[PDB]
Amino acid sequence: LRTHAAGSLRPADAGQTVTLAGWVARRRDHGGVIFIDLRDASGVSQVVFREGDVLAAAHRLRAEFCVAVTGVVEVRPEGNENPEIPTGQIEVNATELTVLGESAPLPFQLDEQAGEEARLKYRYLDLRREGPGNALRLRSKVNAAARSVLAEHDFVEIETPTLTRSTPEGARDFLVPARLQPGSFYALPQSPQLFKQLLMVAGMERYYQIARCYRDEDFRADRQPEFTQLDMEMSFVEADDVIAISEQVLKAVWATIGYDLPLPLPRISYEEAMRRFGSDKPDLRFGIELVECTEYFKDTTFRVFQAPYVGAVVMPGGASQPRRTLDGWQEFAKQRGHKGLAYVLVGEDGTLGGPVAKNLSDAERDGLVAHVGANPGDCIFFAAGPAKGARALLGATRIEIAKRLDLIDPNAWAFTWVVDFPMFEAADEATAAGDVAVGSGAWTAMHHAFTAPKPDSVDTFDSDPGNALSDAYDIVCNGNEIGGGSIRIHRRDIQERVFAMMGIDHDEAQEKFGFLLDAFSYGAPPHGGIAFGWDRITALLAGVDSIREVIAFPKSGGGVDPLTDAPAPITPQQRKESG
Amino acid sequence: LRTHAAGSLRPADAGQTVTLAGWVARRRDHGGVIFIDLRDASGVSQVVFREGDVLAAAHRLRAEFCVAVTGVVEVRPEGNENPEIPTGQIEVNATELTVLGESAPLPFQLDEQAGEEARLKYRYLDLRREGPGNALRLRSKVNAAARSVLAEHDFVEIETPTLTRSTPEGARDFLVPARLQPGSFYALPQSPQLFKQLLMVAGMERYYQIARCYRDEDFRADRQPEFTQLDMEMSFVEADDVIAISEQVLKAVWATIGYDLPLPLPRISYEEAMRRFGSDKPDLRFGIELVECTEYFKDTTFRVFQAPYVGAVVMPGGASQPRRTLDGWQEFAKQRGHKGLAYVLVGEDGTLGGPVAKNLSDAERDGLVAHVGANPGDCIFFAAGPAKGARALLGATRIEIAKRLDLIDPNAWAFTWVVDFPMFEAADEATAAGDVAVGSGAWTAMHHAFTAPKPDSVDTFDSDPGNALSDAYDIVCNGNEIGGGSIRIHRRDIQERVFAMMGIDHDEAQEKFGFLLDAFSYGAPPHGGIAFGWDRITALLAGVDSIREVIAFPKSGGGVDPLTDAPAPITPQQRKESG
Numbered sequence A, B: 001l002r003t004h005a006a007g008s009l010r011p012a013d014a015g016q017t018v019t020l021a022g023w024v025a026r027r028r029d030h031g032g033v034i035f036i037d038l039r040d041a042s043g044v045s046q047v048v049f050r051e052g053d054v055l056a057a058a059h060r061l062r063a064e065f066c067v068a069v070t071g072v073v074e075v076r077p078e079g080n081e082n083p084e085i086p087t088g089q090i091e092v093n094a095t096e097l098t099v100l101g102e103s104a105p106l107p108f109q110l111d112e113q114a115g116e117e118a119r120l121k122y123r124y125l126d127l128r129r130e131g132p133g134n135a136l137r138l139r140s141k142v143n144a145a146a147r148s149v150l151a152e153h154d155f156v157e158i159e160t161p162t163l164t165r166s167t168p169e170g171a172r173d174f175l176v177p178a179r180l181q182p183g184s185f186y187a188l189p190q191s192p193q194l195f196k197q198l199l200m201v202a203g204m205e206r207y208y209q210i211a212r213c214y215r216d217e218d219f220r221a222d223r224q225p226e227f228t229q230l231d232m233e234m235s236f237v238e239a240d241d242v243i244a245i246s247e248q249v250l251k252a253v254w255a256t257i258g259y260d261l262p263l264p265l266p267r268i269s270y271e272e273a274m275r276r277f278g279s280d281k282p283d284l285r286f287g288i289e290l291v292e293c294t295e296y297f298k299d300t301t302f303r304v305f306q307a308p309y310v311g312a313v314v315m316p317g318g319a320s321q322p323r324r325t326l327d328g329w330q331e332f333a334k335q336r337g338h339k340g341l342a343y344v345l346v347g348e349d350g351t352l353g354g355p356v357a358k359n360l361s362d363a364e365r366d367g368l369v370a371h372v373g374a375n376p377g378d379c380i381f382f383a384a385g386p387a388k389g390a391r392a393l394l395g396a397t398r399i400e401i402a403k404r405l406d407l408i409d410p411n412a413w414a415f416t417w418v419v420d421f422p423m424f425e426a427a428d429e430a431t432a433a434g435d436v437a438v439g440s441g442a443w444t445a446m447h448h449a450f451t452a453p454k455p456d457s458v459d460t461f462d463s464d465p466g467n468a469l470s471d472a473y474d475i476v477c478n479g480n481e482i483g484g485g486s487i488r489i490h491r492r493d494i495q496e497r498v499f500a501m502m503g504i505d506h507d508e509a510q511e512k513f514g515f516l517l518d519a520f521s522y523g524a525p526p527h528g529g530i531a532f533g534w535d536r537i538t539a540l541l542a543g544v545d546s547i548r549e550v551i552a553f554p555k556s557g558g559g560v561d562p563l564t565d566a567p568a569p570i571t572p573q574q575r576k577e578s579g
Helices: A052-058 A116-121 A130-152 A193-201 A239-255 A270-277 A323-334 A362-366 A368-372 A387-405 A492-501 A506-519 A534-542 B052-058 B116-121 B130-152 B193-201 B239-255 B270-277 B323-334 B362-366 B368-372 B387-405 B492-501 B506-519 B534-542
Strands: A017-030 A033-040 A043-049 A066-075 A090-101 A175-177 A184-187 A206-214 A226-235 A267-269 A310-315 A342-346 A379-384 A415-419 A424-426 A443-445 A472-477 A480-487 A527-533 B017-030 B033-040 B043-049 B066-075 B090-101 B175-177 B184-187 B206-214 B226-235 B267-269 B310-315 B342-346 B379-384 B415-419 B424-426 B443-445 B472-477 B480-487 B527-533
Touching: A017 A043, A017 A090, A033 A052, A043 A052, A043 A066, A052 A090, A130 A206, A130 A239, A130 A534, A130 B130, A193 A206, A193 A226, A193 A506, A193 A527, A226 A239, A226 A534, A239 A415, A239 A472, A239 A480, A239 A527, A239 A534, A267 A270, A270 A387, A270 A415, A310 A387, A323 A387, A362 A368, A368 A379, A379 A387, A472 A527, A480 A534, A492 A506, A527 A534, B017 B043, B017 B090, B033 B052, B043 B052, B043 B066, B052 B090, B130 B206, B130 B239, B130 B534, B193 B206, B193 B226, B193 B506, B193 B527, B226 B239, B226 B534, B239 B415, B239 B472, B239 B480, B239 B527, B239 B534, B267 B270, B270 B387, B270 B415, B310 B387, B323 B387, B362 B368, B368 B379, B379 B387, B472 B527, B480 B534, B492 B506, B527 B534
Parallel strands: A043 A090, A267 A415, B043 B090, B267 B415
Antiparallel strands: A017 A033, A017 A066, A033 A043, A066 A090, A175 A184, A175 B175, A206 A226, A226 A527, A310 A379, A342 A379, A415 A472, A424 A443, A472 A480, A480 A527, B017 B033, B017 B066, B033 B043, B066 B090, B175 B184, B206 B226, B226 B527, B310 B379, B342 B379, B415 B472, B424 B443, B472 B480, B480 B527
């Protein structure tokens, strides 16, 4: 049908018959003449209807009509040129017109952003808009960039099952009843973790898959019921090898938006990340680091600071703050499961004000500004109490400071690996009210149960779990965790010991993960890997906050599908097969 | 750990310290010396343990132990050279040994093919075998070959949802209950069909996805509950355009095994395919075509041939057949829902024998051999009755003839498109016993409901359904359907008319496919596409019959998973959430 791309027409094309196919972006009438912009994937040419049957037929045209037009390229009359677009100095004088597909009046115009429900219900229209459409095209280039790096390093692309055994690993599975086995269920996978490890036992050596993953969560934190991971695994490797290839993937991926990524990326320990930034996904686009004051307040008589941790965060020029917003700081603190946020105001003199300053000793008041590296005019925030909660509060406080003061360059890309993760977290340590709760559950995995201990934690990890370190690693971009992996356990005895920690008996381990444990009986290799949050990465590259903007047909909060009205009840006929 | 690839060692490497990591393919002892073949992905080097601690430690080694060895490359003693392998003239004199992973005695040896249950339960071991492992590596190259063609022609790779609305389209869906919506269910998709069409309405123009598809079938015909399709769609196209790009995909895919595919591929109509070969997935690696005898027997008085169709298939030299096997031909016929298979024996003279010949007229007996193009010594098989059943029988008969006579070159690749498919099949036309049954159901779709009629069937298709032709097309390889697509309907009124045919009322259409029908209100473009059976294609390229051999972790008959013992019953705790 089509002879030319709409965006390809130039002065050089004058006098030639052309045929374009696409959409009417707009129509405007002046004199007895009809003017349209004809849009296709390659861009836009103006098309005019001046005389005869074509003109009569063009009276039918409206925004988003799908059409084919035939006409003669002409240079636009003097003064009509559109300098802004590549087609700007031509137009097509239409000769023939066929309406391929009529459009009704639009639920929203394409130069408008509608509410979420409307954009999803009419996502086929939303994707005609420049931004949404380009996001999806970007995603395609992103995939290809990753694959090209992986192929260059001899990775094998392997598809893994999505109908699996329901395993008692963390998080709720989506279930699928089996017609041919009344009462039995498949589960959709959370990750291909177990499969990729089996592929290592299989001798595949270097595996990747851009894989669909499924998790039935309470769907906060910008979650989707199904999401995409770039999954990788390698045999005979240490962490450095997984990091080096990951970094090659990241460089090619960022090249897609014309950013040259400087390698290698910074690395920081979990304990250093937590100490310096109060977060294991630290945002390094600005400073405002935590300063420890525990030892500084060792001999204090101020009750609030008689705690196992005291930490500070300095707000630049924050003394000049008005009091109404200082009360909200307390609300900010409470909204997060914390009792409050103490503060010391450093007035223009260098002298300390606020409800804290008077309670400190002369010796404490004195060396304070220096210790926290504050300057006159600043507001120093303090958090005391159990270290994890106090640090998290200070980590959240520095981010809020950076928002409020614009320390945060919207063009910058700041990456880091977080390495040397503890092997375990404490199951449920703090009350919702903010206190230390009585520990019920066993130890829980920091990343996952299949994560290896570091060599000098091998003998100790089940006797001294809280201090045990792992070969796990996260990669962080602008305060977002964009990927995570680890060196795996590849011995049965070590994997059972880990399971014992988690309240999984020898018999329970064999019943639930036996297929993995037995595979380790047949010459399993050292192996390790990583998984990237592909939707997050694509969202960051497109410059949007929500991953919904980079999925073709996403769900909205609650797993509701405005496009198809899924999920929906089924018939009783379908139900009798067979659960 | 590793310094060198095991397959990379040569004479030039003599005297150098190397470190290999992989598996012990075998161990053999002679003198006080231990000899192993060390295998990794790149191949095999012999490694020897001659003196000291290494030798003592090597007494522990067995088949499939995963190890790292350090040693000095030496040229093999005169007479020891293995001319068959690239490493053949060196060996490594081991200096150090670390057992990375012990192996227990194998359930089967790697130079053996075990039974299916064993191969699946221990698929991680089965994939260490040369053939299975190479199959998976081939698959990876196959994907990449397709993607490179699609990228070259500006296709956008787009991921489509796997959690969807359960639609009343053909075939049983896998269901997924939704925790957040007690009583409601997602369905897994049969194909991305509806989504790819919406992406056309979205202006994406050229789409592809290598997609996971789900179907809960009775699991005969080498079916898997989940399978992979290469899915494609384009806007502003006719059949030729979909075929031309498909052919580019096929050429690159076949290039993976060093076959240069001659383009363009042959094309044949559905009616011609059925007439000539009694099949719409004809096997063109041999001849033995159907010859119509309907008009030839127009004036016959032999009751069996007083039928609306009579067809023949000539077996080369089949008169010299013994009688015991001629009775089995009848069983062959009955095993397929047919009453029998008539035959005429052409003896060495050219004179006709058998139970048919005597019943024909002089004039019928005479011109017979000529008409069917037989030669003395041949056996002519006949099928009479309703055309569809008789042709299918003759189509099945010619394939059996070709097996029995080896007319069938195992290296040949014979392709064809089958075009001009009828728009509809008759719902259930024949009895299991072989008779014409009373038609119950409405008309059913030949490919799917979204398939467009040809231009000169547009007004007629719902008044003269049986004669209505479509713009559907299949591509066939060596008697296998390897892909199928069509030009779509893109107007609401035409799609409702199709639904009416199928017993889907206006109200039922809007309730079940409204999201598609409404999308057609907003300037839908002409569009068309194709889906390839990716597992079948990969199986053909690997040279195996079963697609199980080209899936990393396949199910066996019944959707049973010997690897993980899925599907399995769930806990009552899990069940209370929430169906």
